[PDB]
Design an enzyme around this catalytic site. Structure first.
Site, PDB file in Angstrom:
ATOM      1  N   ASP A 138       0.802  -1.215   0.000  1.00  0.00           N
ATOM      2  CA  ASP A 138       0.000   0.000   0.000  1.00  0.00           C
ATOM      3  C   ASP A 138       0.838   1.269   0.000  1.00  0.00           C
ATOM      4  OD1 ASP A 138      -2.259   1.598   2.381  1.00  0.00           O
ATOM      5  OD2 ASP A 138      -2.108   1.800   0.200  1.00  0.00           O
TER       6      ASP A 138
ATOM      7  N   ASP B  74      -2.280   5.682  -5.268  1.00  0.00           N
ATOM      8  CA  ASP B  74      -2.639   4.813  -4.145  1.00  0.00           C
ATOM      9  C   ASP B  74      -2.900   3.366  -4.567  1.00  0.00           C
ATOM     10  OD1 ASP B  74      -3.319   3.904  -1.642  1.00  0.00           O
ATOM     11  OD2 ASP B  74      -5.354   4.721  -1.683  1.00  0.00           O
TER      12      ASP B  74
HETATM   13  C1  LIG Z   1     -11.961  -3.536   2.054  1.00  0.00           C
HETATM   14  C2  LIG Z   1     -11.141  -2.890   0.951  1.00  0.00           C
HETATM   15  C3  LIG Z   1     -12.108  -2.281  -0.073  1.00  0.00           C
HETATM   16  N1  LIG Z   1     -11.489  -2.325  -1.407  1.00  0.00           N
HETATM   17  C4  LIG Z   1     -11.560  -3.563  -2.200  1.00  0.00           C
HETATM   18  C5  LIG Z   1     -13.020  -4.041  -2.272  1.00  0.00           C
HETATM   19  C6  LIG Z   1     -13.069  -5.582  -2.332  1.00  0.00           C
HETATM   20  C7  LIG Z   1     -10.814  -1.131  -1.930  1.00  0.00           C
HETATM   21  O1  LIG Z   1     -10.296  -1.153  -3.040  1.00  0.00           O
HETATM   22  C8  LIG Z   1     -10.749   0.171  -1.069  1.00  0.00           C
HETATM   23  C9  LIG Z   1      -9.763   0.298  -0.068  1.00  0.00           C
HETATM   24  C10 LIG Z   1      -9.700   1.457   0.701  1.00  0.00           C
HETATM   25  C11 LIG Z   1      -8.615   1.614   1.828  1.00  0.00           C
HETATM   26  O2  LIG Z   1      -8.974   1.548   3.010  1.00  0.00           O
HETATM   27  N2  LIG Z   1      -7.215   1.839   1.498  1.00  0.00           N
HETATM   28  C12 LIG Z   1      -6.260   1.967   2.578  1.00  0.00           C
HETATM   29  C13 LIG Z   1      -5.363   0.760   2.590  1.00  0.00           C
HETATM   30  C14 LIG Z   1      -6.298  -0.467   2.722  1.00  0.00           C
HETATM   31  C15 LIG Z   1      -6.578  -1.263   1.615  1.00  0.00           C
HETATM   32  C16 LIG Z   1      -7.435  -2.363   1.738  1.00  0.00           C
HETATM   33  C17 LIG Z   1      -8.005  -2.654   2.969  1.00  0.00           C
HETATM   34  C18 LIG Z   1      -7.730  -1.849   4.068  1.00  0.00           C
HETATM   35  C19 LIG Z   1      -6.881  -0.759   3.954  1.00  0.00           C
HETATM   36  C20 LIG Z   1      -5.441   3.261   2.461  1.00  0.00           C
HETATM   37  O3  LIG Z   1      -4.250   3.015   1.780  1.00  0.00           O
HETATM   38  C21 LIG Z   1      -6.245   4.295   1.725  1.00  0.00           C
HETATM   39  N3  LIG Z   1      -5.358   5.135   0.944  1.00  0.00           N
HETATM   40  C22 LIG Z   1      -5.715   6.549   1.127  1.00  0.00           C
HETATM   41  C23 LIG Z   1      -5.456   6.948   2.578  1.00  0.00           C
HETATM   42  C24 LIG Z   1      -4.867   7.406   0.215  1.00  0.00           C
HETATM   43  C25 LIG Z   1      -7.242   6.791   0.791  1.00  0.00           C
HETATM   44  C26 LIG Z   1      -7.992   7.637   1.592  1.00  0.00           C
HETATM   45  C27 LIG Z   1      -9.332   7.857   1.301  1.00  0.00           C
HETATM   46  C28 LIG Z   1      -9.921   7.232   0.213  1.00  0.00           C
HETATM   47  C29 LIG Z   1      -9.173   6.381  -0.593  1.00  0.00           C
HETATM   48  N4  LIG Z   1      -7.835   6.163  -0.311  1.00  0.00           N
HETATM   49  C30 LIG Z   1     -10.625   2.501   0.482  1.00  0.00           C
HETATM   50  C31 LIG Z   1     -11.606   2.377  -0.508  1.00  0.00           C
HETATM   51  N5  LIG Z   1     -12.515   3.456  -0.700  1.00  0.00           N
HETATM   52  C32 LIG Z   1     -12.839   3.871  -1.961  1.00  0.00           C
HETATM   53  C33 LIG Z   1     -13.736   4.950  -2.134  1.00  0.00           C
HETATM   54  C34 LIG Z   1     -14.275   5.579  -1.036  1.00  0.00           C
HETATM   55  C35 LIG Z   1     -13.943   5.163   0.227  1.00  0.00           C
HETATM   56  C36 LIG Z   1     -13.048   4.088   0.396  1.00  0.00           C
HETATM   57  C37 LIG Z   1     -11.675   1.218  -1.293  1.00  0.00           C
END
Ligand SMILES: CCCN(CCC)C(=O)c1cc(C(=O)N[C@@H](Cc2ccccc2)[C@@H](O)CNC(C)(C)c2ccccn2)cc(N2C=CC=CC2)c1
Length: 329
Positions: free
Chosen positions: A34, A214
């Protein structure tokens, strides 16, 4: 074989994971690599939640190089939250390894049901130090500091479902990963891997927009007013009161993202931000685009973007290299 390579496995074209080891006995763990966070955490054997029953766990007692920290820490992601305590041990990534500070996780209830539903064990951060919890020097940075690598940079070459595998490369850039020109963009802050690009979607234009690269997001997020303006009048239809839009795959009205700078030009075609759902009609699809507003108008370039563009993340030069990823090998 000159640089360090970690093979990336594609998960149904929506995600991708990479494996790494913890402890001097190389305990294997599946990680989300990430560039949107800067912390590393694994589930512990001391874990008391149900999710940890389906994951690979970290046993400090089995590691000779384990150093007790015990400092309580509570990681908050957008998706959910995991909690535990700090611990120091030998982290092995590919053929490289170093004593590193990470988070032994006891509680994963805040990370459910996403945690159990997914196949990864933990998250590995690839952001800058100021983004990390507990002020932890980025792993690649520390690797260069210990002279394990020449250049403090890492490149992402994402996999494609039923085509080719992916790679996370540490130490240098490999020519095989991209074709065409490799164009660098300076960071506007040493926080996220964020660069300034002018965004263009048909008539809609937002200049000097903040773009965050990201890998932890499997979508392209865009300012809400931007998305709203760019969706009319495409023959797209909103899922009832769910924040997702769907349309026919053969929709010709679907536009192309154009992020332009003085250095280079990068585009994103409909084929990259469309996900496939039902085979009924002539192909039904979902737009992998999310409306998201920040104090500074921000585009988040997630998995779709990086699946088209081989990316380079340069700590030393504080910049992001973008190149068109080579079609096959
Ligand atoms: C359960 C994961 C969901 N998923 C796959 C669906 C099967 C994603 O693609 C996904 C992963 C994340 C995430 O938590 N990213 C964080 C890292 C992470 C990844 C996976 C699980 C948990 C944590 C962070 O790296 C987010 N990165 C930043 C902080 C830049 C961010 C902040 C706000 C919104 C989007 N990204 C966020 C999102 N969102 C997309 C749009 C609006 C809100 C959130 C989607």
């Amino acid at each position: 074989s000159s640089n360090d390579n970690i093979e990336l496995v594609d998960f149904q074209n929506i995600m991708f994971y990479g494996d790494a080891e913890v402890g001097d006995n190389q305990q294997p763990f599946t990680f989300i690599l990430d560039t949107g966070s800067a912390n590393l955490w694994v589930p512990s054997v001391k874990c008391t939640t149900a999710g940890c029953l389906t994951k690979h766990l970290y046993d400090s007692s089995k590691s000779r190089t384990y150093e007790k920290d015990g400092t309580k820490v509570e990681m908050n992601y957008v998706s959910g939250t995991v909690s535990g305590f700090f611990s120091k041990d030998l982290v092995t990534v590919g053929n490289l390894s170093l004593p590193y500070k990470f988070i032994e996780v006891i509680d994963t209830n805040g990370f459910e049901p996403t945690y159990t539903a997914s196949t990864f064990d933990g998250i590995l951060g690839l952001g800058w130090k100021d983004l990390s919890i507990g002020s932890v020097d980025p792993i690649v940075v520390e690797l260069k500091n210990q002279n394990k690598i020449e250049n403090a940079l890492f490149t992402f070459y994402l996999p494609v479902h039923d085509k080719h595998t992916g790679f996370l490369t540490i130490g240098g850039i490999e020519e095989r990963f991209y074709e065409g020109p490799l164009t660098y963009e300076k960071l506007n802050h040493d926080l996220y891997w964020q660069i300034t690009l002018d965004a263009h979607v048909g008539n809609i234009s937002l200049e000097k927009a903040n773009c965050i690269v990201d890998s932890g997001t499997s979508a392209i997020t865009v300012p809400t007013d931007f998305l709203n303006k760019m969706l009319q009048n495409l023959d797209v239809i909103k899922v009832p009161f769910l924040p997702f839009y769907v349309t026919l795959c053969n929709n010709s009205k679907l536009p192309t993202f154009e992020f332009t700078s003085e250095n280079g030009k990068y585009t994103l075609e409909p084929e990259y931000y469309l996900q496939h759902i039902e085979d009924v009609g002539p192909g039904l699809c979902m737009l992998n685009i999310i409306g998201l507003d920040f104090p500074v108008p921000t585009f988040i370039l997630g998995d779709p973007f990086m699946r088209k563009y081989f990316t380079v993340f340069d700590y030393d030069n504080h910049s992001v290299g973008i190149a068109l990823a080579k079609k096959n090998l």
